[PDB]
Design a protein around this ligand. Structure first.
Ligand SMILES: [Mg+2]
Ligand SMILES: [Mg+2]
Ligand SMILES: [Mg+2]
Ligand SMILES: [Mg+2]
Ligand SMILES: [Mg+2]
Ligand SMILES: [Mg+2]
Ligand SMILES: [Mg+2]
Ligand SMILES: [Mg+2]
Ligand SMILES: [Mg+2]
Ligand SMILES: [Mg+2]
Ligand SMILES: [Mg+2]
Ligand SMILES: [Mg+2]
Ligand SMILES: [Mg+2]
Ligand SMILES: [Mg+2]
Ligand SMILES: [Mg+2]
Ligand SMILES: [Mg+2]
Ligand SMILES: [Mg+2]
Ligand SMILES: [Mg+2]
Ligand SMILES: [Mg+2]
Ligand SMILES: [Mg+2]
Ligand SMILES: [Mg+2]
Ligand SMILES: [Mg+2]
Ligand SMILES: [Mg+2]
Ligand SMILES: [Mg+2]
Lengths: 120, 43, 185, 144
RNA sequence: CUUUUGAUGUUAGGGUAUUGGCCUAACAUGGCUAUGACGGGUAACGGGGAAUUAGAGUUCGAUUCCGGAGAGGGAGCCUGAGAAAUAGCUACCACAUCUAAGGAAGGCAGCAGGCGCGUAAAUUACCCAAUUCUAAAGAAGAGAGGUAGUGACAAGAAAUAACAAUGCAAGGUUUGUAUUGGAAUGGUGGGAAUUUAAAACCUUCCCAGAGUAACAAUUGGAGGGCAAGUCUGGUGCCAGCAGCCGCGGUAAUUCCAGCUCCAAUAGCGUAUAUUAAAAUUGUUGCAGUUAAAACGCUCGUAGUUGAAU
């Protein structure tokens, strides 16, 4: 709970619908803070009614504990996030999941197409 | 001639096994010890 | 393809491997400044040596040649930062006059030994490796670390050490405490 | 006078003489003649694998008196027969009369070494176990 | 040497996307060469570079980029803006697969993987997340590419204790070193936090968690060169070692051991090559009475060198 987030090279970006930033979490002594808490803090900071326009990533915890760098992304609305975030990040967040086993026996299947009028 | 003698002397010698020793120091510690032996108290 | 992450040898070997005097000198150095190999010494020599070479090159050029003034000046500044020269001896002829002691002095372990903290050099080294010591915010567990004069004053036991205020937090002390508790109950 | 020309425009002569003369240097000749690849068992290599043909003794140079234990082996690479001295106090018997030996140089490029007359090679592995290891014995035992 | 077979040129053409003996015809007799032509060799792709150098240099450069070339071997085409394409086609040669014997398809010097060759080299892994390309161009593909796996190729950092008591030691009270004993901590094991396309590592925190801290450092040496034993047994010109000189013929400081020591140390040996050491290829920078080496002598073309003004 004794952890300040200082937010660096913050950058509004209306080409996308997001605020980018780098993000340092000072948490002296009591090491490591989970993403959820950080997100909450961010929300508190920027009024930001709903928590899940925030996407955090790249949280490296640095040698010795105590500090911890990351990258914050904050979208305008969930629609925006849906539109231009890559799927993996969305999945991680928990907005969606397709657990689709396309695999790369997909590739094999594709190359097994020689003459098509094939459902099969 | 004789390839019969190949491995004479070694075979002859009595096998005295190693023995227990005080596990030696290594790296820095060893260096320190060496220094002490050479220069510090003897100097 | 190959990666482009280029890499470099930090230490040249001797040349004449069983010269007595040199060996003795190396040993002395090791003794004094708590070093693990001759490799450390070699590394530091290399570090020194590059600088020395640069200085020599600069001196071959005349004053108010652009290169000499710029690069030489930069070198001097770097040396000053490192804690090799200071106030009196900042003229580029002086950066030649550096020896190994000058460099070893600025190793973190040596600094630690100097500024109280540990009874010995060896002790200091072990402290450093055992995650105590910090050099301005950041912990540091490599004794080699060349402390710059900007961050000499900001050296002490880290925030998270047992003897920098963050619980006995050991296998030892904690265990002892537990034992005591058990005995009590 | 110097011997050499020291003209400003002399370079051709200077180069050319050096080019011809280099070949008097023995080492240079050894490096740059093509007979290296032809007339060498290892054929420009560190080691070679040879099956053994004959465990054999070689009497040493006159002052010293020993019969050094060699192994006449046939290189698989080249079909070349060569004697290779086997180290160790009793390491002739550690090899078989037909064993796939891995043989190295002796330390002096081609040139022969020490007491031995004209054995330029040091067997240093038998059936993939290291001769040195076998000699030590605490490390390994010959698999067959 | 090149020239019937275009060698060198001129003219006219043909051809090309265009120039051109590029090809044809006609006509000249040229062209290159001791400043090495033409052959031969290269264990030769070129270059950017690499190693090693005080400075010169010497060697290397298959190999991150640029260029060239090739897709078993030659040759030939089609398509197309671009191919003389090879996961296009035709043919032959050389390999080789299926076949009901009629035919048919095939080309890893793409990625893995296998046999062979060999001194000599990793997984038939996961993914398009990043970097890019292609497309009807966010949204699909990509063994391009990336991520892990194997990996002592190299490269970097860095544990294997430290500290304090007495006991013992030596020094002019302090350093050093045998008993104890509380502190420190990685490693290792398990959870998370994070990381990531998903994992794994990294780091991070929390539980576990050293005293013979068995969580056990090796490698190669101890005559010299060369740092370190004329310590103990064994062998007895044998076995062996020894890069070199040498050691061994019953005191071996050299063999075989044990102990002790020395070096470098998570590395350390051996081999082959290479650079330096090599002013032992000498431009800097060698030597030539006698050590290797002044042509028997002079003339002489190229070559190099050339008074002053
Ligand atoms: Mg800790
Ligand atoms: Mg004609
Ligand atoms: Mg070639
Ligand atoms: Mg190349
Ligand atoms: Mg080749
Ligand atoms: Mg092939
Ligand atoms: Mg083709
Ligand atoms: Mg293919
Ligand atoms: Mg073909
Ligand atoms: Mg392959
Ligand atoms: Mg290999
Ligand atoms: Mg992409
Ligand atoms: Mg690839
Ligand atoms: Mg000596
Ligand atoms: Mg040897
Ligand atoms: Mg004896
Ligand atoms: Mg011995
Ligand atoms: Mg050389
Ligand atoms: Mg030189
Ligand atoms: Mg000479
Ligand atoms: Mg003479
Ligand atoms: Mg004469
Ligand atoms: Mg003339
Ligand atoms: Mg003149």
């Amino acid at each position: 709970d004794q952890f300040t987030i200082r937010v660096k090279k913050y950058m509004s970006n209306p080409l996308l619908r997001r605020k980018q930033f780098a993000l340092e979490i000072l948490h002296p002594n009591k090491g490591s803070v989970a993403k959820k808490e950080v997100k909450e803090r961010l929300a508190k900071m920027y009024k930001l009614n709903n928590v899940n326009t925030i996407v955090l990533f790249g949280f490296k915890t640095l040698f010795g504990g105590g500090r911890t760098k990351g990258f914050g992304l904050i979208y305008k609305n969930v629609d925006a996030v849906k539109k231009f975030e890559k799927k993996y990040r969305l999945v991680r967040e928990g907005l969606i999941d397709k657990e689709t086993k396309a695999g790369r026996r997909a590739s094999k299947e594709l190359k097994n197409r020689r003459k098509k009028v094939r459902g099969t | 001639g004789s390839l019969a003698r190949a491995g004479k002397v070694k075979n002859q010698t009595p096998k005295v096994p190693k023995l227990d020793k005080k596990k030696r120091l290594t790296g820095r510690a060893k260096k320190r010890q060496l220094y002490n032996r050479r220069f510090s108290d003897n100097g | 393809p190959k990666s482009y992450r280029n890499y470099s040898k930090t230490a040249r070997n001797p040349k004449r491997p069983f010269e007595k005097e040199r060996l003795d000198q190396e040993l002395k150095l090791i003794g004094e400044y708590g070093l693990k190999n001759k490799r450390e010494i070699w590394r530091v020599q290399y570090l020194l040596a590059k600088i020395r070479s640069a200085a020599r090159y600069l001196l071959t050029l005349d004053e108010k040649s652009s290169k000499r003034i710029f690069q030489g000046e930069a070198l001097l500044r770097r040396m000053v930062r490192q804690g090799l020269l200071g106030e009196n001896e900042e003229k580029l002829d002086y950066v030649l006059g550096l020896t190994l002691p000058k460099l070893l002095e600025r190793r973190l372990q040596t600094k630690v030994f100097k500024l109280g903290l540990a009874k010995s050099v060896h002790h200091a080294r072990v402290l450093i490796r055992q995650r105590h010591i910090r050099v301005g915010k950041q912990m540091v567990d490599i004794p080699s670390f060349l402390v710059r004069v900007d961050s000499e004053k900001h050296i002490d036991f880290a925030t998270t050490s047992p003897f920098g205020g963050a619980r006995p937090g050991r296998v030892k002390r904690k265990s002892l405490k537990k034992q005591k508790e058990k005995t009590e109950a | 006078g110097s011997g050499k020309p020291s003209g400003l425009r002399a370079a051709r002569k200077l180069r050319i003489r050096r080019r011809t003369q280099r070949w008097a240097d023995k080492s240079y000749k050894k490096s740059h003649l093509g007979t290296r690849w032809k007339s060498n068992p290892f054929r420009g290599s560190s080691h070679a694998k040879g099956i053994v043909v004959e465990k054999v003794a070689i009497e040493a140079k006159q002052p010293n008196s020993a019969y050094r234990k060699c192994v006449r082996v046939q290189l698989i690479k080249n079909g070349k027969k060569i004697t290779a001295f086997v180290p160790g106090d009793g390491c002739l018997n550690f090899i078989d009369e037909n064993d796939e030996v891995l043989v190295s140089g002796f330390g002096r490029s081609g040139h022969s070494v020490g007491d031995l007359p004209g054995v330029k090679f040091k067997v240093v592995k038998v059936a993939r176990v290291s001769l040195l290891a076998l000699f030590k014995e605490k490390k390994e035992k010959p698999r067959s």
